[PDB]
C-alpha cells in the first residue's frame, strides 16, 4: 500500500476500456506468481471513506430536517447520492443495448439478402462485415464502461454507509436491546449487499427495452404471426420462478434434515469409547443410515428440480423457433431463410437479456430489505453527556435532587450527594439496590429528569466483566498513551503482575484473545492506574480476586497512589470501609444513612445488621477416485453420451430447419397464370407435412432427452456421494481411539458437518453447468468447422491464446482472493473487539481513535476486493474481444465464397457464430469453482485413506464357551501397559488375583494407573507384556464382541443418548417389558415413569438434560444392571440422593464381583479389600481393617 496516485485518475478512456493498468499488474503477477500488500495501490482521494461519510451524513441531516424523523426514506438519500453516476450508467447501457440490437439483426438481414442474390458485389459485403465488427466492438466497450462506473459508485456507497453506520453504533445508548450477532452482521455483509444493489441494478435497467425491440422487429419482419414467437418467454418464465421457489422449499427441508443428522453425529462421536466397549455400533449405524436415506430423498427431489432449471436458453430458443415456424408454414404464409435466421439471432439476443435480469431483481429485493434494516438501526436514542460545570472546581461531582427511570421503571428517588476532591467515598448496599444504576447514571447513559448534575474532569472506570482489548499486554495498558519505563514498572509491581509475566514466556508481547478472571481484573486495574484521569470510580475490584492479594493491592494502590485524587469505591464486601474516608449506604434507590464510619455503626442502623452478618491444485488421482466412487467409467460414459445426445438433437432441429429451407420447390412445375414454369416456392412441395411432423418429433426429443439426462445425472451423483459417506462411516467406526486421543473432535465434526453438505449441494451443480457449457461451445464450434474447416484451423491459435489467458486470470484471481481474505479477517476481529466493550470506550472518550482505525481497516480491506472485481471484468472484456474476432472472421469467410453455398447453410452458420458470443468467462469461472470443490473432495479422500484398521470383531480363537465366564476369578501376571509409543509405561510389573463375589477398591494418586485397569481388562489397548487370566482363560484368545458382550461398567458422568427411553435402555429390544419393569422397580423409577403417558416413549434429548441428577444416575445404573454381566466395575460414581444411590448399588449387585474405582475414602470404607497404586505398582494387599490399624500403612496416611 505505497503509491502516489491511483492509476484511475491518470488513466485515459482507452486505458479505462482495456484496463491496461491491471494488464501490467497481471503481467507482473505472472512473472512472480505471488502477491504482497506492498505491490497493490492504495485508495484514491475520490473514494476516500471520510469524504463520502461527510456527504452522506450531510444529506441524511438535510432529509431529517426536511421531512422529520418520522417518514424518512434512505432510498431518496442514496438516490441523490448516486444520481449522476446512475444516469451515466443507464445512458451507457442503453447505448450497449441499442448497438447489440442494431448490429446483429440488421447486418445479418442484409448479408443474407445479399447472399440470396445472384450478382457478386464485394464492395458491399466487406462494408457489411466492417459494420458488424464495429457494432460488436462498440457494444463490448460500452458494456465495460458501464461496469466500471457501477463498480466505482458501489465502492463509494459501501464505504460511506459502513462508516456512517459505525459512527451511529458507537453513539448508541444501550447494547442489550439488540443481539450482538446481528449488530456484527450489519457491518459485515451489508457492504456486499449495497455493492450488489448498485452494480446489478444499473445492469437491471437494460432488459425490457431490448426485449420490446426484439418483439417489434420480429413482428414487423414476419407479420401478425410474430405474437406466437414473442409469447413463449411470457408463458415460460413463470415456470422458472416456480422452479426456483420449489427448490428453495426443498432446500429448507434438507437443511433441517442435515441439522438433525449432524446433531446425531456429534452425539455419537462424543462418547465414541463408551460405545466402543459396549458393541452398540450397529444401532447408531442404522439410525444414521435411515436419516441419510431421508435426506437423500429430499436431495433427489431438489436435484431433479435444479437440473430441470439449468440450461433453458437453447431450449427456449428452439421451442420458440419450432412453434413460430410451424404456425407460419401451416397457415399458408411464405418465408425465406433470411427472415428465419434474423428471427433466431434476435431470439438469442432477448435470451441473453432475460437471463441477465432475474438475479438483478433478486439483488434489488435484498437491497430493499437491507436499507430497511439500516433505517431501523438509524432511529434509536443517542447517548447524551452531562456537560454542566459545577460551581467550583473543588467539587468535581455535584448533583441535586435528580430522579431517574431505567429505559426498557423508576429506581432512584430524591438523591442528594456531594463529593469533594481527594476524598475516598465508599458505597454500601445489596444486589439490586441501585449501585449499578447510580454508577451508570453518573456515566451518562441516563437522562436528566429533575435538578441538574455537575460533572468536571475526566473519568476512570473499571468493569465488572473486565473487558480485555484484543491486543498484547503492552498495548492495552497504555491505551493510546506514550510509553514509560519507571511508571509502567511501578504500576505492574503494584498490581502483582509479575506472576503473569513469569508464567507466560512471551507475556509482554502475547496477543490476548477476545486467561483467568483475576488476571483480567488486575490488568484492568493496571490500565486504570496508568490512565491517570481526574475522577476514579471503581466497582467490586476484589470480587473474583483472591482476598489476600486483593487486600495487598488495595493497600499498596488505593491507600498509596490515589490519596490525592477523587476516588469512588463500590464493593460487595463491607470489611474494606473501615479505613475509608466516607461511607454511603445505598438502599432501594433512596439515601437512608450516610456519614463517617464510626458514626455509621453508632447510629445502629440496618448497616450494622448486615455488617455483623459477614463477621460471623489437485492431481488426476482425485478425479480418478471420484469417478471410481461414481460407479466406474460406465456411468461417466453414459452421462457424456446423454449430454452429447441432447446437444446433437438441438443440432438436429436446427439442421432440419436448414434442410427444409434448402429443399425449396423440389423441381415442381406449377402454373402462375397463362404460362407454367418451375417456381422455387416452399408451399409447392407436397411433403411439408412430413417436415412439420419431424419438427414435432424434434420438440418431443428435446423435452424427453433433457428430463432423462437431468434425472440420470442427479441419481448418479447422489449414489456416488452416498457411497463415499457409507465408506467413511464404516472406516471411522472401526478406527482406533488414539485418533480421538490425539486429534480434537472439532476437525472430524467439521469434516462431517460442512464438507459433506458442501460437496452434496455444490459439486453436482457446478459440474453439470460446466459440462453443459463446454459441450455447447464444442458442438457449436464443431458445426461451424463442419461447414468450413478453414475456420477450425483459424480458431486453433485462438484456442491456445484462450488457454494462456485462462491461466493468467486464474493466477491473478487466486492471489487477489487470498489478499482479500487476509485483509478481511482482522477487520472482523476489530469490530468484535470494539463492540464487546463499548461502555469503557465511551467512558474514556476514545471514540475518534477507534473510528480512525476502522477507516484505515476499511480502506486496506476494500482495496484488494475492488482490484479483484476489476480483474474479473478485464478477463471478461478480453474473452469478449476474442469472440468478436471469431464473429468477424466467420462473417468474412461466409462473404468470400458468395454464390457457392445455399443461403440456409450460411444463415445457420452465422446464427451459431452469433450464439458463440458471451460463453467463455462462464467456462473459466465454472472451472475455478469445480477445481475448488475437487480440492475439498481431495481433502476428504486423504482424510479417509489415512485411516487404519483394528483387530476384527471375529477371530480364529472362536467363542471361549457358551457359558463364559464360568466364574468371577481374575488373575493378573506382570501387566505392562503404556498409553502410546515412547510414552512412559503406566503399568509396571503388577500381578494380583481377585476372588469371586468380593468388593475391591482401588485408591491412588492422580495418574497412578487407576484408570488404566479399565482399558487393560477390556483389551481396548493391546497389552505390551504379561498375560491376564479370567477363569483360567487368557483374554487375548477371545473375540472383541464375545468378551465385550459380557462386560459392563458405569462411568463417572451419566451418558444419555438422544431418543426415547426404550432406545436409551435397550435399542435391540432383546428384553421383555416385564423385565424392564422389574429393573425399573429395583432402581425405583416406575414412580417417575408410569404417570407419563409416553412412559416407554418418553423423548430424551442430548445428554438427557431434563430429568434430575438422581434420575439420570438411576437410569444409568439400570443400564448396567439389566445386562446381568458377571464382572462390573464402577469409576467414581459421584446428600440424601447420594446415600440413596450408594445403598441402591450396595443392594443391587451383592451376587457378582465388584471392582470400585473410587477417589473418596469415606464411600469405600468397610470394603472387603483395598487396592493401592504407587505410580503404577501395588505396595499393600490386605483388608482395610488391618490397614487402618497400622500407622505405617500407606492406606492410613491420607485417612487423617
Amino acid at each position: 500500500t505505497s503509491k502516489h496516485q491511483h492509476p484511475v485518475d491518470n488513466a485515459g478512456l482507452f486505458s479505462c476500456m482495456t484496463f491496461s493498468w491491471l494488464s501490467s499488474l497481471a503481467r507482473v503477477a505472472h512473472k512472480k506468481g505471488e502477491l504482497s500488500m506492498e505491490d497493490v495501490w492504495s485508495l484514491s482521494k475520490h473514494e476516500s471513506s471520510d469524504v463520502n461519510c461527510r456527504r452522506l451524513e450531510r444529506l441524511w441531516q438535510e432529509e431529517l430536517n426536511e421531512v422529520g424523523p418520522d417518514a424518512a426514506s434512505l432510498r431518496r438519500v442514496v438516490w441523490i447520492f448516486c444520481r449522476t453516476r446512475l444516469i451515466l450508467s443507464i445512458v451507457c447501457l442503453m447505448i450497449t443495448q441499442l448497438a447489440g440490437f442494431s448490429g446483429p439483426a440488421f447486418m445479418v438481414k442484409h448479408l443474407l439478402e445479399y447472399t440470396q442474390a445472384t450478382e457478386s458485389n464485394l464492395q458491399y459485403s466487406l462494408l457489411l462485415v466492417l459494420g458488424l465488427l464495429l457494432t460488436e466492438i462498440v457494444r463490448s466497450w460500452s458494456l465495460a464502461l458501464t461496469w466500471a462506473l457501477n463498480y466505482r459508485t458501489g465502492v463509494r456507497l459501501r464505504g460511506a454507509i459502513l462508516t456512517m453506520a459505525f459512527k451511529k453504533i458507537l453513539k448508541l445508548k444501550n447494547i442489550k436491546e439488540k443481539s450482538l450477532g446481528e449488530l456484527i452482521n450489519i457491518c459485515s455483509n451489508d457492504g456486499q449487499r449495497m455493492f450488489e444493489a448498485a452494480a446489478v441494478g444499473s445492469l437491471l435497467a437494460g432488459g425490457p427495452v431490448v426485449a420490446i425491440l426484439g418483439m417489434i422487429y420480429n413482428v414487423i419482419i414476419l407479420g401478425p404471426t410474430g405474437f406466437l414467437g414473442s409469447a413463449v418467454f411470457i408463458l415460460f418464465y413463470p415456470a422458472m420462478m416456480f422452479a426456483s421457489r420449489l427448490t428453495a422449499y426443498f432446500r429448507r427441508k434438507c437443511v433441517a434434515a442435515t441439522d438433525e443428522r449432524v446433531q446425531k453425529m456429534n452425539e455419537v462421536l462424543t462418547y465414541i469409547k463408551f460405545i466402543k466397549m459396549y458393541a452398540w455400533v450397529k444401532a447408531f449405524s442404522q439410525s444414521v443410515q435411515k436419516i441419510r436415506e431421508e435426506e437423500r430423498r429430499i436431495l433427489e427431489k431438489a436435484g431433479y428440480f435444479q437440473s430441470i432449471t439449468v440450461g433453458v436458453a437453447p431450449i427456449v430458443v428452439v421451442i420458440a423457433s419450432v412453434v413460430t415456424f410451424s404456425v407460419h408454414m401451416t397457415l399458408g404464409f411464405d418465408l425465406t431463410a433470411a427472415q428465419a435466421f434474423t428471427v433466431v439471432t434476435v431470439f438469442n439476443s432477448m435470451t441473453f437479456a432475460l437471463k441477465v435480469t432475474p438475479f438483478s431483481v433478486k439483488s434489488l429485493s435484498e437491497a430493499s430489505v437491507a436499507v430497511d434494516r439500516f433505517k431501523s438501526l438509524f432511529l434509536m436514542e443517542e447517548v447524551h453527556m452531562i456537560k454542566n460545570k459545577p460551581a467550583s472546581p473543588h467539587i468535581k461531582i455535584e448533583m441535586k435532587n435528580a430522579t431517574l427511570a431505567w429505559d426498557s421503571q423508576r429506581t432512584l428517588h430524591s438523591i442528594d450527594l456531594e463529593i469533594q476532591e481527594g476524598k475516598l467515598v465508599g458505597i454500601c448496599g445489596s444486589v439490586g439496590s441501585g449501585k449499578t444504576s447510580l454508577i451508570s447514571a453518573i456515566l451518562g447513559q441516563m437522562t436528566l429528569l429533575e435538578g441538574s448534575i455537575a460533572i468536571s474532569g475526566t473519568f476512570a472506570y473499571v468493569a465488572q466483566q473486565a473487558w480485555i482489548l484484543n491486543a498484547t499486554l503492552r498495548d492495552n495498558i497504555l491505551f493510546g498513551k506514550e510509553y514509560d519505563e519507571e511508571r509502567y514498572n511501578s504500576v505492574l509491581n503494584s498490581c502483582c503482575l509479575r506472576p503473569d509475566l513469569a508464567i507466560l514466556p512471551s507475556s509482554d508481547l502475547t496477543e490476548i484473545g477476545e486467561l483467568s478472571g483475576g488476571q483480567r481484573q488486575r490488568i484492568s486495574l493496571a490500565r486504570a492506574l496508568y490512565s491517570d484521569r481526574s475522577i476514579y470510580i471503581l466497582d467490586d475490584p476484589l470480587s473474583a480476586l483472591d482476598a489476600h492479594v486483593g487486600n495487598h493491592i488495595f493497600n499498596s494502590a488505593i491507600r498509596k497512589h490515589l490519596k490525592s485524587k477523587t476516588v469512588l469505591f463500590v464493593t460487595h464486601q463491607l470489611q474494606y470501609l473501615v479505613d475509608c474516608d466516607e461511607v454511603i449506604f445505598m438502599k432501594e434507590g433512596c439515601i437512608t444513612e450516610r456519614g463517617t464510619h464510626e458514626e455509621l455503626m453508632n447510629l445502629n442502623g440496618d448497616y450494622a445488621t448486615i455488617f455483623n452478618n459477614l463477621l460471623l491444485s489437485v492431481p488426476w488421482s482425485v478425479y480418478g477416485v471420484y469417478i471410481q466412487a461414481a460407479g466406474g467409467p460406465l456411468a461417466f460414459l453414459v452421462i457424456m453420451a446423454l449430454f452429447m445426445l441432447n446437444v446433437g438433437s438441438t443440432a438436429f432441429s436446427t439442421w432440419w430447419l436448414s434442410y427444409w429451407i434448402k429443399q425449396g420447390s423440389g423441381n415442381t412445375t406449377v402454373t402462375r397464370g397463362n404460362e407454367t414454369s418451375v417456381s422455387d416456392s416452399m408451399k409447392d412441395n407436397p411433403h411439408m407435412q412430413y417436415y412439420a411432423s419431424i419438427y414435432a418429433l424434434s420438440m418431443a426429443v428435446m423435452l424427453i432427452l433433457k428430463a432423462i439426462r437431468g434425472v440420470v445425472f442427479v441419481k448418479g451423483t447422489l449414489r456416488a456421494s452416498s457411497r463415499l459417506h457409507d465408506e467413511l462411516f464404516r472406516r471411522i467406526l472401526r478406527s482406533p481411539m488414539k485418533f480421538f486421543d490425539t486429534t480434537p473432535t472439532g476437525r472430524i465434526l467439521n469434516r462431517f458437518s460442512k464438507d459433506m453438505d458442501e460437496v452434496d449441494v455444490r459439486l453436482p451443480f457446478q459440474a453439470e453447468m460446466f459440462i453443459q457449457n463446454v459441450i455447447l461451445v464444442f458442438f457449436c464450434v464443431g458445426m461451424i468447422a463442419g461447414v468450413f474447416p478453414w475456420f477450425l484451423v483459424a480458431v486453433g491459435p485462438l484456442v491456445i491464446l484462450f488457454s494462456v489467458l485462462h491461466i493468467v486470470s486464474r493466477v491473478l484471481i487466486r492471489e487477489l482472493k487470498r489478499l482479500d481474505n487476509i485483509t478481511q479477517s482482522p477487520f472482523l476481529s476489530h469490530i468484535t473487539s470494539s463492540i464487546q466493550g463499548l461502555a469503557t470506550i465511551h467512558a474514556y472518550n476514545k471514540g475518534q481513535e477507534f473510528l480512525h482505525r476502522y477507516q484505515e481497516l476499511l480502506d486496506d480491506n476494500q482495496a484488494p476486493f475492488f482490484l479483484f472485481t476489476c480483474a474479473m471484468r478485464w478477463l471478461a472484456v478480453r474473452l469478449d474481444l476474442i469472440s468478436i474476432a471469431l464473429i468477424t472472421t466467420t462473417g468474412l469467410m461466409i462473404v468470400l465464397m458468395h454464390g457457392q453455398i445455399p443461403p440456409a447453410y450460411a444463415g445457420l452458420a452465422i446464427s451459431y457464430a452469433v450464439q458463440l458470443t458471451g460463453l467463455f468467462q462462464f467456462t473459466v469461472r465454472l472451472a475455478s469453482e469445480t477445481e475448488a470443490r475437487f480440492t475439498s473432495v481431495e481433502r476428504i479422500n486423504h482424510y479417509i485413506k489415512t485411516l487404519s484398521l483394528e483387530a476384527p470383531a471375529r477371530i480364529k480363537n472362536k467363542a471361549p464357551s457358551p457359558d463364559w465366564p464360568q466364574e468371577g476369578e481374575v488373575t493378573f501376571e506382570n501387566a505392562e501397559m503404556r498409553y502410546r509409543e515412547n510414552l512412559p509405561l503406566v503399568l509396571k510389573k503388577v500381578s494380583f488375583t481377585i476372588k469371586p463375589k468380593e468388593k475391591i477398591g482401588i485408591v491412588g494418586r492422580t495418574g497412578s494407573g487407576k484408570s488404566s485397569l479399565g482399558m487393560a481388562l477390556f483389551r481396548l489397548v493391546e497389552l505390551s507384556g504379561g498375560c491376564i487370566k479370567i477363569d483360567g482363560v487368557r483374554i487375548s484368545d477371545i473375540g472383541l464382541a464375545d468378551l465385550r458382550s459380557k462386560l459392563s461398567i458405569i462411568p463417572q458422568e451419566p451418558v444419555l443418548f438422544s431418543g426415547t427411553v426404550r432406545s436409551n435402555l435397550d435399542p435391540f429390544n432383546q428384553y421383555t417389558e416385564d423385565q424392564i419393569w422389574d429393573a425399573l422397580e429395583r432402581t425405583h423409577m416406575k414412580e417417575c415413569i408410569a404417570q407419563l403417558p409416553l412412559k416407554l416413549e418418553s423423548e430424551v434429548m442430548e445428554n438427557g438434560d431434563n430429568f434430575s441428577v438422581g434420575e439420570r444416575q438411576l437410569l444409568c445404573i439400570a443400564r448396567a444392571l439389566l445386562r446381568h454381566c458377571k464382572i462390573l466395575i464402577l469409576d467414581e460414581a459421584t446428600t440424601e440422593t447420594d446415600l440413596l444411590i450408594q445403598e441402591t448399588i450396595r443392594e443391587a449387585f451383592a451376587d457378582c464381583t465388584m471392582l470400585t474405582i473410587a477417589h473418596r475414602l469415606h464411600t469405600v470404607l468397610g470394603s472387603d479389600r483395598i487396592m493401592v497404586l504407587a505410580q503404577g505398582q501395588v505396595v499393600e494387599f490386605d483388608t482395610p481393617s488391618v490397614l487402618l490399624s497400622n500407622d505405617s500403612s500407606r492406606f492410613y496416611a491420607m485417612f487423617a
Binding site: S244, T309, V310, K355, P358, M769, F868, A876, L926
Partner: peptide, 14 residues
C-alpha cells in the same frame, strides 16, 4: 439458482 449464478459469474463474486 442457475440464473442467479449466471450474472454473478460475469464479473461479480460467487
Amino acid at each position: 439458482d442457475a440464473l442467479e449464478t449466471a450474472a454473478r459469474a460475469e464479473g461479480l463474486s460467487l
